[PDB]
Design a protein around this ligand. Structure first.
Ligand code: HEM
Ligand code: HEM
Ligand SMILES: Cc1cc(N)nc(COCC[C@@H](CN)OCc2cc(C)cc(N)n2)c1
Ligand SMILES: Cc1cc(N)nc(COCC[C@@H](CN)OCc2cc(C)cc(N)n2)c1
Ligand SMILES: C[C@H](O)[C@H](O)[C@H]1CNc2nc(N)[nH]c(=O)c2N1
Ligand SMILES: C[C@H](O)[C@H](O)[C@H]1CNc2nc(N)[nH]c(=O)c2N1
Ligand SMILES: [Zn+2]
Lengths: 407, 411
């Protein structure tokens, strides 16, 4: 019930007391660990409100004050009456920052307190959402000097009026399945890309076509919008030593911006809440480029390097994987667009773990996701025991809306 | 209750019913996952259930379930427990049990090989010298001049827990480490303490960078004894790189035989506290962990120096770059000297096939993702993308305290 975690490289031992505030469930039991699965009323709402307001007022050193009790009172009044309630701006800012502090899969959390929050609760139409998103993208991009932000659309009501952003990120490349049997562009997005066509987009049918936003306001059918091309910062990918690398014609976008998640604050559900920071190099170079189900460019790169592709034990995949990742980091740095490498990012997160243990008595972390998809054991998070648990406020997954929505 | 695991690269879904036969706890609850935590005297009363379970399993596998022979054996074990408070396994049960312990080892990527395992019965062993003899035979048989064969050696089970057989070494073959007055380490930092025990026990240490440690052996609860493995029996491989001629001047070598000697084999409630077992290496165990962990040989800097990589900022990926070269070198060296080894692409691909086979024939395969995914190039191996269920079956390999922490010195 007081739990220790050890680092096996530094012998440093931390004690975790924060897990005892754990509210949600893991998928795990005493008989089966599910640590590696990707996805494992008036009544219910007041408990959830109180727990949140309790943490808010405690965090402002005002726990048990009249202001605290008054708000608890007022929120109670409002729920009994209206069956939901509204967050004060300050609460909303605190809850969003905290949903990020609590994301156990995020290596980037040392940054959690510098989140710019844009309150879009007054938005009513998709065009409004388009406007709020364009502003988010531009503020966050900041001419390549990236700044973290989140934009919060109105909260769920009766569930018949959700605001959703259909895209999974604000900025992603299209995918088209070809007669040739293969797949052009990003195969992750094939299905979404078809819905844009079914909804009316005219795809350039290219390899790196920035997708149209598909926006749903007040539970209405969703609507198409192109992001002003001038707002979508992109980086052409070159190598500091391999001149031929440019000839691959690889580019990636600067702005990682997750748009399909659901933000839960004090019981309220914000089903559209796109947020963004900046990339860790491996996200693009290891996963986007090299996953079999993605752009999968290892075969082609290794060929240009003239490596012995005859046998797996030449480690030609591994060799090419490194150079690709050097190239991503090099390109972004040269174009002055913010990026972080896996060494620096995991080192930073260890320091952030330290701080959270000292100051909060823990830090939920999911090892499976925190350890980078290349060079695991040479980054220090590999050697670091972590405890994974669910704290609220939080971001949660939700079904792709095309399975949910009715036309 | 059925459970599905998905593969995110192939969309293959598999169904697990085998987790239904799970006994021991994981360490996880509905409120906490402890899946990345490294480590999360028996009465008659607890014993016969565990005996019976095991023998039902055994007897199913040989398709004799409920036979006369099954029933006789149950009754026999029953009596033997009530009379002597324990029981002895037949050879066939021992064999079956040990294979299954491996089969159930959810942190083991090599399990496709689970059924080819040479079992050596050392249950007649009575002394440390007797242990040494058995172990030398094990090293030599398994080594097989480079064409490694899986094997395990099983010494007598625990009785009152005052008479334990233990191999104080964590592996039968490992290099010494010596902390120096300046704070640096000569040799393998992982073995500093055990080295010190060996020294304190009377071993004269060469004090080199690759000194094969002496076996330190405990029989029947007695104080342990030092023995040097005959060096002619210790197959080693000098490390060179196919392209970099300066690689050999680093002076690296490694031993061919990975042989774990610190685990506890549980079978039908019986506890075998000395059961050294051996396989062959996955290249990354040496190349990534043994050479490149900061708390081991830690050679990244010196390889990168020699490669003249840009070392001034991490974002050159100089570490990742040296790491690959070293792993190329380990694998090249072993193949060149004809010592069996497997690379991590080939090991993980084979493991995915074993795993699907296990679903189809057995109704599952417990697997620990944190351990199965190699410690370099994670996502370019097919296991990264495989959802896994982790749960404990018996028979099994368990951890146990290091024996200097618990042993009662007779002096
Ligand atoms: C500052 C730059 C940031 C870096 C380098 C970063 C890093 C990461 C990484 C490496 C992942 C794993 C995802 C994957 O591999 O596909 C992740 C997931 C996540 N991050 Fe962060 N992050 C950053 C900013 C943020 C911000 C601003 C938020 C919230 C406001 C956030 C919340 C999350 C959430 C909720 C997930 C899980 C996504 C999922 O489960 O699918 N990240 N982030
Ligand atoms: C065929 C050759 C084999 C290969 C390539 C292989 C590979 C591995 C690897 C990579 C690990 C993770 C250890 C680490 O990275 O530190 C492992 C762990 C394990 N293996 Fe296998 N293995 C093989 C044979 C065997 C045999 C013969 C047994 C027992 C009969 C076995 C039982 C285990 C156990 C119990 C663990 C976990 C050890 C621990 O947590 O301390 N392995 N093996
Ligand atoms: C298929 C799938 C399902 C699922 N639930 N999650 C994933 C992976 O998460 C997708 C979003 C990932 C992709 N690199 O980005 C996380 C992230 C967010 C932010 C704000 C910054 C950053 N660098 N990285 C994939
Ligand atoms: C903390 C800790 C405790 C403990 N008992 N074991 C470990 C790590 O495992 C050590 C043994 C590892 C070394 N790579 O060997 C596993 C293995 C066994 C066998 C039979 C073959 C093989 N290739 N690999 C770590
Ligand atoms: C099956 C497994 O859970 C899945 O492949 C996970 C593994 N770890 C990951 N880690 C990160 N950061 N991102 C991912 O998408 C994944 N995928
Ligand atoms: C804390 C963490 O569980 C620990 O470093 C584990 C991670 N995965 C591992 N995986 C293997 N194969 N071997 C190891 O020693 C470890 N160490
Ligand atoms: Zn778990």
């Amino acid at each position: 019930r007081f739990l220790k975690v050890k680092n096996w490289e530094t012998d440093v031992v931390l004690t975790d007391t924060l897990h005892l505030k754990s509210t949600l469930e893991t998928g795990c039991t005493e008989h089966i660990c599910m640590g590696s699965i990707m996805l494992p009323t008036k009544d219910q709402l007041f408990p959830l409100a109180k727990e949140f307001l309790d943490q808010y007022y405690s965090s402002i050193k005002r726990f048990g004050s009249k202001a605290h009790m008054d708000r608890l009172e007022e929120v109670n009044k409002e729920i009994e009456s209206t069956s939901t309630y509204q967050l004060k701006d300050t609460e909303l800012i605190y809850g969003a920052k905290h949903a990020w502090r609590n994301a156990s899969r995020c290596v980037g959390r040392i940054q959690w307190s510098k989140l710019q929050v844009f309150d879009a609760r007054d938005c009513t139409t998709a065009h409004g959402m388009f406007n709020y998103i364009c502003n988010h993208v531009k503020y966050a991009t900041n001419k390549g000097n990236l700044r973290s932000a989140i934009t919060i659309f109105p909260q769920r009501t009766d569930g018949k009026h959700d605001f959703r952003v259909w895209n999974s990120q604000l900025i992603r490349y299209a995918g088209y399945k070809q007669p040739d049997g293969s797949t052009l562009g990003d195969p992750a997005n094939v299905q979404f890309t078809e819905i844009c066509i079914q909804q009316g987009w005219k795809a350039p049918r290219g390899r790196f076509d920035v997708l149209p936003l598909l926006l749903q306001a007040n539970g209405n059918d969703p609507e198409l919008f192109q992001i002003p091309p001038e707002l979508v910062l992109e980086v052409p990918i070159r190598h500091p030593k391999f001149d031929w690398f440019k000839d691959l014609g690889l580019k990636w976008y600067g702005l990682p911006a997750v748009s399909n998640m659901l933000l839960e604050i004090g019981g309220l559900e914000f089903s559209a809440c796109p947020f963004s920071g900046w990339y860790m190099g491996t996200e693009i170079g290891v996963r986007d480029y090299c996953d079999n189900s993605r752009y999968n460019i290892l075969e082609e790169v290794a060929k240009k390097m003239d490596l012995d592709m005859r046998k797996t034990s030449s480690l030609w995949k591994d060799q090419a994987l490194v150079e690709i990742n050097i190239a991503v980091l090099y390109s972004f740095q040269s174009d002055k667009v913010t990026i972080v490498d896996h060494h620096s990012a995991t080192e930073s997160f260890i320091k952030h773990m330290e701080n959270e243990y000292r100051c909060r008595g823990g830090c939920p972390a999911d090892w499976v996701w925190i350890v980078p998809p290349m060079s695991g054991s040479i980054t220090p998070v590999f050697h670091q025991e972590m405890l994974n648990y669910r704290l609220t406020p939080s971001f949660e997954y939700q079904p792709d809306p095309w399975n949910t929505h009715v036309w």
